[PDB]
């Protein structure tokens, strides 16, 4: 019943043809699925397993293991907030407070329109520019609420 | 057009790995070629794989990923086994405070690519991989584009520069697990499986990817390979102290005036890194502690140590996180405990339960909700994460926290 749109299926086949073995493309495929839907739809796992020539249980275990993948909440933009040591030291709590003031949500929550989800994450590798956050693939240093508000207004 | 990347400050006294990466922008193949780029590859292809291994061995280059294994020796172990062989560039990074690898990837990708080609030729690998953490999407797109540029210039594909040497570099992405930086879990992830570390021996150099001889090297280790070929092993050995030679990248963060990456010789002291290079502390406050990533904790009395691989040296990956006099050590220890709780793969029972309990009990201590039993339990679990552990994570999950208990007892005591 569930079938990937041709535009996405083409992208998935491209990843499957990229590595010497089909099964090596599993994570690139799941990144592609999440980038398209704004989450991993549970129903997408069976046709993906078929394309990768892997059992469904294998694919389910992989999705559960790699925590960048979200099977529960659909969100257009994932605000990944570093909660590790350097960012904590430099102002994670100020960034989280500014996010709540602007968006009305706390970590783990999604805005009512399904536009933004705050995702607490471990060290993003930009510690010198702490406190760090990402908005999908874009990464930034949080400076203040006014600066953060201008950044978020670019995601429509 | 690539996704937004923060503009990490970078400075060098050696002008080697940061010759271009000191500028916060992508340096494409034409700019790399203008600096004499890919000429070390051409020289390498006129040498035998065995001579390249000899040069890399004689240079004294040691792994930059944390274990510090001599690179030339690792390659020597791999080629003692029959082919096909695989070469893997470990770009998982992800340790708290560590951001040295991404600046090579995102600003000077051809330096890494050239090093991967030379290394693959040295070990007879015709298939190479870059495994980059999923949270570096710009690095991924930059590498895919740079690999295409290298292919079009004839530095990749079949019969490279008429040498008969074939090579394809595939870029794989991680998807959230710190454990995927551990070389065996990285290999499992490349096979399309969960990043679960495997028991060693067998070591990857004997049985790695698809059970074949596999060399895994860190981004920074590989970035040195074009310099050893270009300068020759003897001239490379002249850089820094003769016992820990070559350039080293130091990611400095926390309470410093100029946080960023510093390319320095390994005879530089920790005090010089902070005060001479990183501009001293924020507000000129006293250094309280230096966290060597999530691995070690050094007190203000240990700043005159060298930034090398010596037993009394800084060690680790040269990751410098500075805490000053007002930073609460218990709150800082909690963040380290939370990191290990989140990243244990859970295969080993004392690691699985110990990383979880260490963080859960430390949170109770921090919030003032800990009973006398919770304090004793916390002390016990911190000393018991390592038993039966398959990989390095279980062996170090309690290390930094134990050093804070030994070096800052008065601060811990005010929570009791
Ligand atoms: C839990 C754990 C995580 C690791 N993460 C990394 C990492 O992100 N990057 C890295 O190059 N090495 C990492 N290592 C070390 C690798 O297993 C391996 O020693 C290294 O990639 C070999 O390259 P090198 O000899 O050039 O240092 C990690 C080790 C452990 C135990
Ligand atoms: S020591 Fe910890 S991280 Fe390593 S394999 Fe065992 S459970 Fe996983
Ligand atoms: S601690 Fe937040 S990016 Fe490293
Ligand atoms: Cl099935
Ligand atoms: Cl020559
Ligand atoms: Cl290791
Ligand atoms: Cl005991
Ligand atoms: Na990863």
Numbering used by the authors:
A (entry chain A): 5 to 160
B (entry chain B): 3 to 418
Task: Quote the study that presented this structure, word for word.
Complex I couples the transfer of two electrons from NADH to ubiquinone (Q) with the translocation of four protons across the membrane. The L-shaped complex is structured into a peripheral arm that protrudes into the aqueous milieu and catalyzes electron transfer with one FMN and 8–10 iron–sulfur ([Fe–S]) clusters, and a membrane arm embedded in the lipid bilayer that mediates proton translocation. We have determined structures of the electron-input module of complex I from the hyperthermophilic bacterium Aquifex aeolicus, encompassing subunits NuoE and NuoF that contain the FMN cofactor, the [4Fe–4S] cluster N3, and the [2Fe–2S] cluster N1a, respectively, both in the air-oxidized and dithionite-reduced states at resolutions up to 1.8 Å. Here, we show that the redox state of N1a regulates NADH oxidation in complex I by inducing a conformational change close to the NADH-binding site.
